[PDB]
Amino acid sequence: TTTILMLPWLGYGHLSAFLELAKSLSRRNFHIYFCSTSVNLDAIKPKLPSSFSDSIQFVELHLPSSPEFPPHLHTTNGLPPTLMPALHQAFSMAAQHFESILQTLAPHLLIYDSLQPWAPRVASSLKIPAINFNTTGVFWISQSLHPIHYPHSKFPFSEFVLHNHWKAMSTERTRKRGEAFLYCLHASCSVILINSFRELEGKYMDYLSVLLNKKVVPVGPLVYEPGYSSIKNWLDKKEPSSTVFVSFGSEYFPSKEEMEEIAHGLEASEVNFIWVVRFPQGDNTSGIEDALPKGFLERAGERGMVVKGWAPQAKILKHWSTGGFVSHCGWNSVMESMMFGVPIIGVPMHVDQPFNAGLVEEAGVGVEAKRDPDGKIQRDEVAKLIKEVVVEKTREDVRKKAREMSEILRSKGEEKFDEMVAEISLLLKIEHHHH
Numbered sequence: 248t249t250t251i252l253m254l255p256w257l258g259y260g261h262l263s264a265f266l267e268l269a270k271s272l273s274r275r276n277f278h279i280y281f282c283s284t285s286v287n288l289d290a291i292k293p294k295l296p297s298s299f300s301d302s303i304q305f306v307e308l309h310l311p312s313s314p315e316f317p318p319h320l321h322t323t324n325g326l327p328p329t330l331m332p333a334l335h336q337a338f339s340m341a342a343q344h345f346e347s348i349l350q351t352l353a354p355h356l357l358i359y360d361s362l363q364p365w366a367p368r369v370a371s372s373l374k375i376p377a378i379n380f381n382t383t384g385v386f387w388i389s390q391s392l393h394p395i396h397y398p399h400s401k402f403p404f405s406e407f408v409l410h411n412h413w414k415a416m417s418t419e420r421t422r423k424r425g426e427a428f429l430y431c432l433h434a435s436c437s438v439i440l441i442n443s444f445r446e447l448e449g450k451y452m453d454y455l456s457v458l459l460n461k462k463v464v465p466v467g468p469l470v471y472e473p474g475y476s477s478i479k480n481w482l483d484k485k486e487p488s489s490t491v492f493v494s495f496g497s498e499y500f501p502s503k504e505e506m507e508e509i510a511h512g513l514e515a516s517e518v519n520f521i522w523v524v525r526f527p528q529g530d531n532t533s534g535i536e537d538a539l540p541k542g543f544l545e546r547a548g549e550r551g552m553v554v555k556g557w558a559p560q561a562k563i564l565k566h567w568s569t570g571g572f573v574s575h576c577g578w579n580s581v582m583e584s585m586m587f588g589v590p591i592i593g594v595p596m597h598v599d600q601p602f603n604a605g606l607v608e609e610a611g612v613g614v615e616a617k618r619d620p621d622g623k624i625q626r627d628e629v630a631k632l633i634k635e636v637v638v639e640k641t642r643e644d645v646r647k648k649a650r651e652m653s654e655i656l657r658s659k660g661e662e663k664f665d666e667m668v669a670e671i672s673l674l675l676k677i678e679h680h681h682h
């Protein structure tokens with residue numbers, strides 16, 4: 248009877264976190280309208296068990312479409328990076344359709360992502376309470392917000408240093424992007440929901456709450472648990488905790504030079520590895536052999552397996568043969584790895600990833616391969632950390648911390664959603680009176 252419409256950003260990681268949050272709300276007797284573009288809805292539907300179909304319904308949001316930018320491209324999943332400005336612009340142009348959806352479905356609440364300032368504005372115009380749900384962690388946000396208030400002060404609560412490669416990478420344009428992101432958090436009604444847990448980020452959540460003067464409510468970690476037959480057969484031939492899964496997420500394509508450093512690091516380590524290699528949608532002129540160093544797979548032999556396009560990440564991470572994760576440190580991948588007790592070898596690429604890698608290093612559940620002074624990935628770093636964490640297991644402290652973190656995360660049940668449910672109930676009761 249109480250209805251919530253959820254509007255994630257058009258990225259697969261965002262959709263996935265929103266879907267897990269929808270399931271938690273469905274278990275609390277809420278009816279959910281899950282709204283996204285058709286290509287995103289098609290990608291996420293196989294991850295919703297049929298038992299949830301009655302409670303969780305998918306609603307198609309239409310973006311402007313053209314032969315140059317057709318609906319199969321209305322996602323960041325595999326999108327050429329140069330189309331990201333168009334995708335953001337097209338999403339802002341879906342506001343009129345979103346208003347029509349809200350008028351037709353009249354949901355009691357809207358949960359929106361941090362990439363859409365228009366969404367709380369449409370909701371306010373229709374007198375629908377709106378709450379911001381952030382699918383990422385809080386460490387990077389608190390780090391980004393701290394210099395605004397304290398320009399001459401070190402970030403407290405952490406010894407993390409951002410490498411110059413990221414510190415270096417239109418000024419007015421960057422400021423506007425940050426203002427739009429912060430507005431989504433600031434505009435939220437009463438509370439901000441965050442995909443995080445206090446044991447990992449409690450101090451940072453509290454600091455963010457003070458800076459924004461807004462209550463921050465953790466609802467994490469939100470981890471989904473479900474070509475695998477072939478992969479499992481190969482993993483079954485390996486020793487326990489001997490293989491590393493290599494993945495850079497659904498939105499990033501490493502350059503040839505980056506792939507060269509990763510490949511040589513894997514080769515030098517002598518580890519078993521499963522590596523997902525992807526090419527942007529529309530690129531039928533590119534191939535695995537082209538993107539990888541000459542003879543690398545032939546040298547690896549039985550030790551190496553390359554998976555084209557997409558892999559069952561959760562199932563691989565849960566396999567007894569998996570001992571490490573070479574990851575770009577996307578938040579969903581970090582949370583999954585922590586839940587499954589797999590140590591992370593960090594190869595962050597951009598946006599929040601460097602911060603996530605630093606948090607993983609600070610927790611002690613993983614290690615970060617450092618970039619060189621010119622900002623390049625180093626094959627020697629990758630080889631050294633794989634050798635220490637998976638092949639020789641000289642870093643027993645990291646393996647122990649990863650197991651302890653997994654034990655903590657596995658111990659949490661539906662109680663983690665109690666604070667969000669109580670805040671939703673209070674907000675709806677207050678708004679009921681006002682309108």
Ligand SMILES: O=c1ccn([C@@H]2O[C@H](COP(=O)(O)OP(=O)(O)O)[C@@H](O)[C@H]2O)c(=O)[nH]1
Nearest residue numbers: 260496497498523557558560577578579580
């Ligand atoms: O081959 C792949 C690559 C990624 N994922 C899933 O894609 C999501 C990636 O989210 P993340 O936040 O880690 O990074 P992003 O793709 O947003 O950069 C995670 O749930 C991964 O488990 C997967 O299932 N198979």
